[PDB]
C-alpha cells in the first residue's frame, strides 16, 4: 500500500515549478506580449489562465495526489475504458526526450565556448563567415551571432535537408552525453535525490534573472524596450487570434497531459493541500514569464538604441532569441564574458528540471504498471537514456536541427491537445465531477467551488477545442527558412503525432472485447472506478 513520498514539501513544489518553468517562458511569452498589443495582451492571457489553464493544471495535480499512481495506472483505475489515455500521454513524454534535450546541449556548448576574453560570435572575419555577414541583425543580411550558431556550431549549411543529415558533431554528442549524465544521476535513485537537484535547477534561473534584470535595466535605452514590451493596445482584445495566442500559450506553459504533474503529485501525502499547490505553482510560472520579459526587452531595447537595429529584427521568438539575438547584445556590454556565462547556464537549468519531469513521468508511470522494472530503476533509466543518446546522435548531426524541428512541430503539438481533451471528458463526464469533488474534499478538506466544477466540464472542452481549431487553421506544410520539408517527412511527423493518441481507441477497443457480457454490461465494467471494491 505504501509508496515513497517527498522528503520535504519544497522538493515537490520546486519539481513542479522546475518542470513548468521553461525557456518558453523566455521566448514564447515576451514575444506574444510584443506582437499582440502590449500590456493589453495580459487581459486575454489572464482570463484564459483563470478559466482554462489553471483549472487543467489543478485537475491533473489533484488526480496525482489522489490515485497515488503514475499516468498509466491512474487512468486505468479512474476509467478502465480510457486507460489508453495513460499510454498515449507517457510515450508523448518519451518522444519529446528525443529532441528536447538537444536544447540543453546547445546551451552547454555555448557555455563551454564562453570561456574566452573575446566572444567568438562578435566579429564577421572568421573562418565560418560569409560576405552576407553584418555585426548585428539587418533586413536582407545575416549577423555575426547568426552565422556563428549556424555555420560553426550547427554546421547546418552543410545540410540540404532532413534526408541529408551529414556527419556527426562529436563536440555536440559530448554535450548531449553530459546532459544525459546529469539527468541520469539526478533520477537514478528517484525523488530522494531528484527532489534535491531541483533546488538548483529551479532556483538558479531566478538568481540569474535577477542579475540580468539589473544589468538589462542599467543599459542605455532599456526603458525603450519596456515600451515595446508593455505599451497597451486594446485593439488586440477584439482579435480572436490574440485570444487564441493567449489560450495556446497559457495551456502550453503549464503543461498538463504529460503525466508528470500526475506523476509528481502522486508522491504527495493524501491529505496535502494540493489546491494551494496548483494555484501557487501556476502563478509563479506566469510570473516568471513576466519577469523574463523585462530581462529580454531591456536588452532588446538596448540594441535598438546604442547599436542601431530595428526592433522588428530583434523581437524574435524561437531558439534564435537566446542563441543569436541576446548573446549578440551581451557581446557589446562590459564584462561580457560574465553575463554570457550565467545566461547560457540559466538556459541550461531552464530545461533540465523540465526534462527531469518529462523523464520522471515515464519512469514513474511505468514502475506502477510493471513491477519488474520498479526493482530495476537504475538499469532501466540506463537503457532509456542510452536509447535517448543513441537516437540523439541524429540530433548531433550537421542537419540535426532539421530533425529537431520536425519532432518539435509534431511529437507534442497536436498529440497533447486531443489527449488532454479526453482527460477532461473522462474525469468530468465519464468519471463525473460530483465524485471527483468528493475525492478532493476527502483529501484537502473542501469540495471544489462551483467555479472549478463548471470550468472542468464546460469551459475546459471548449477552451481546448478553441486552441485545437485555430492550430488547424494556421497549419501549413513544415518549413524552416527556405527549406521546405518533403511531404514524406510531414507524413512521418503525423505518424509520430498519431502514434500517441491512437492508443486511446485501440486500448479502448481491445479492453472492450473483454470482459464478458453484453454491450451495455461492458461499458458499465469499464467505467466502474477501481475504488469500488
Amino acid at each position: 500500500d505504501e509508496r515513497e513520498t517527498w522528503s520535504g514539501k519544497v522538493d515537490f513544489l520546486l519539481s513542479v515549478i522546475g518542470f513548468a518553468v521553461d525557456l518558453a517562458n523566455v521566448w514564447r511569452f515576451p514575444y506574444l506580449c510584443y506582437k499582440n498589443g502590449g500590456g493589453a495582451f495580459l487581459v486575454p492571457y489572464g482570463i484564459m489562465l483563470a478559466v482554462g489553464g489553471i483549472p487543467l493544471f489543478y485537475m491533473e495535480l489533484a488526480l496525482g495526489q489522489h490515485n497515488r499512481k503514475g499516468a498509466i495506472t491512474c487512468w486505468g483505475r479512474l476509467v478502465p475504458l480510457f486507460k489508453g489515455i495513460g499510454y498515449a500521454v507517457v510515450l508523448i513524454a518519451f518522444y519529446v526526450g528525443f529532441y528536447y534535450n538537444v536544447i540543453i546541449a546547445w546551451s552547454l556548448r555555448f557555455f563551454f565556448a564562453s570561456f574566452t576574453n573575446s566572444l567568438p560570435w562578435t566579429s564577421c572575419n572568421n573562418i565560418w563567415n560569409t560576405p552576407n555577414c553584418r555585426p548585428f541583425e539587418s533586413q536582407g543580411f545575416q549577423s555575426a551571432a547568426s552565422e556563428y550558431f549556424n555555420r560553426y556550431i550547427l554546421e547546418l549549411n552543410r545540410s540540404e535537408g532532413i534526408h541529408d543529415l551529414g556527419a556527426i558533431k562529436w563536440d555536440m554528442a559530448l554535450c548531449l552525453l553530459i546532459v544525459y549524465l546529469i539527468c541520469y544521476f539526478s533520477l537514478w535513485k528517484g525523488i530522494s535525490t531528484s527532489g534535491k537537484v531541483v533546488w538548483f535547477t529551479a532556483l538558479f534561473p531566478y538568481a540569474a534573472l535577477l542579475i540580468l534584470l539589473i544589468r538589462g535595466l542599467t543599459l542605455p535605452g532599456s526603458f525603450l524596450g519596456i515600451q515595446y514590451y508593455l505599451t497597451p493596445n486594446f485593439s488586440a482584445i477584439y482579435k480572436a487570434e490574440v485570444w487564441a495566442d493567449a489560450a495556446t500559450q497559457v495551456f502550453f506553459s503549464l503543461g498538463p497531459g504529460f503525466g508528470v504533474l500526475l506523476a509528481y503529485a502522486s508522491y504527495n501525502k493524501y491529505h496535502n493541500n494540493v489546491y494551494k499547490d496548483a494555484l501557487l505553482t501556476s502563478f509563479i510560472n506566469s510570473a516568471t514569464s513576466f519577469i523574463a520579459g523585462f530581462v529580454i526587452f531591456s536588452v532588446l531595447g538596448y540594441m535598438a538604441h546604442t547599436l542601431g537595429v530595428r526592433i522588428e529584427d530583434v523581437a524574435t521568438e524561437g531558439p534564435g532569441l537566446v542563441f543569436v539575438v541576446y548573446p549578440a547584445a551581451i557581446a557589446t556590454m562590459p564584462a561580457s564574458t560574465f553575463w554570457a556565462l550565467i545566461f547560457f547556464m540559466m538556459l541550461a537549468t531552464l530545461g533540465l528540471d523540465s526534462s527531469f519531469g518529462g523523464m520522471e513521468a515515464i519512469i514513474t508511470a511505468l514502475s506502477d504498471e510493471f513491477p519488474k522494472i520498479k526493482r530495476n530503476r537504475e538499469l532501466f533509466v540506463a537503457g532509456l537514456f542510452s536509447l535517448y543518446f543513441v537516437v540523439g546522435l541524429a540530433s548531433c548531426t550537421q542537419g540535426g536541427f532539421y530533425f529537431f524541428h520536425l519532432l518539435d512541430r509534431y511529437a507534442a503539438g497536436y498529440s497533447i491537445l486531443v489527449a488532454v481533451f479526453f482527460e477532461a471528458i473522462a474525469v468530468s463526464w465519464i468519471y463525473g465531477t460530483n465524485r471527483f469533488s468528493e475525492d478532493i474534499r476527502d483529501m484537502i478538506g473542501f469540495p471544489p467551488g462551483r467555479y472549478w466544477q463548471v470550468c472542468w466540464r464546460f469551459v475546459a472542452p471548449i477552451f481546448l477545442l478553441f486552441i485545437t481549431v485555430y492550430l488547424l487553421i494556421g497549419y501549413e506544410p513544415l518549413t524552416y527558412a527556405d527549406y521546405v520539408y518533403p511531404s514524406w517527412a510531414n507524413a512521418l511527423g503525423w505518424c509520430i503525432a498519431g502514434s500517441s493518441v491512437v492508443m486511446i481507441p485501440a486500448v479502448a477497443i481491445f479492453k472492450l472485447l473483454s470482459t464478458p457480457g453484453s454491450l451495455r454490461q461492458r461499458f458499465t465494467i469499464l467505467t466502474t472506478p477501481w475504488r469500488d471494491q
Partner: antibody
Amino acid sequence: EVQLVESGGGLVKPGGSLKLSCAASGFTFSSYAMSWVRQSPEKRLEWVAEISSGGRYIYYSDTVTGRFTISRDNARNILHLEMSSLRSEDTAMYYCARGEVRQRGFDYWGQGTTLTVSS
Amino acid sequence: ENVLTQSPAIMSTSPGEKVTMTCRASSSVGSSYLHWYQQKSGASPKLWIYSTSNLASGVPARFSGSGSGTSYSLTISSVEAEDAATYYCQQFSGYPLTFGSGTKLEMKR
C-alpha cells in the same frame, strides 16, 4: 430552509439492534457529507461516524467501529445509522449533522433522537 | 484519540462582565480546524465559531476566538443574559473527531 429530523430511536435491550434515520430538506443532499454525533445523558458530545457526499469515504470512532454502519440514500435524501451489539454506553441523544467542509465543521444540527440501551 | 480539555467546567458571570473559556488539546491541532459550538438547554447544538476566530452566521460581534497548536480560547466581550448555555470546542485536525468536555455558563444573581 435547511432542516434535519431524526427518526427511529427508543428502548433497546443489550445486544439488540436499531436503525436510526435522518430526513434532510433544503439543500442538495448529494453535496454534503453527513455525520452522526451522540450526546451522553451527562451532556457530553462524542463523534460517531462520518459519511461522504457520495458515501465512498467512511470514518468511524474506535469505541463504535465494528458494530455500527452508517448509510446514505442521496435519492430520497435520507441518512441511516444501523446499530448492532448495543451496550449501555450507547445510551445517548443521537444527532444528525452535515459537516461537508472540514475547515468549517457541522453547520446544521437536527432535532435529535433518543436511544436508551438498558436491561 | 485527540482529547480536548476545556476549563472551566461551570462558570458564573453577571451580565456585562468579560469571560474567557479555554480549550487545550493533547495534540497539535490545525488552526483552521478548531471550531466552537453553543448548546442552550433542551436544544441541539449550533455552530458558533468556525476556523478558530471566524464567527458563524447569526453570532453577535461580542464573541471572538483565539489560539493555536495546543491552546485555544473563546471570549465574550460583554456578556448578556441570552448567552447562558454550554460551549463545546471541537477539533477537525484528524480522525477520530473529538469534542471538548464543554464549559457551562450560568448568570449571577
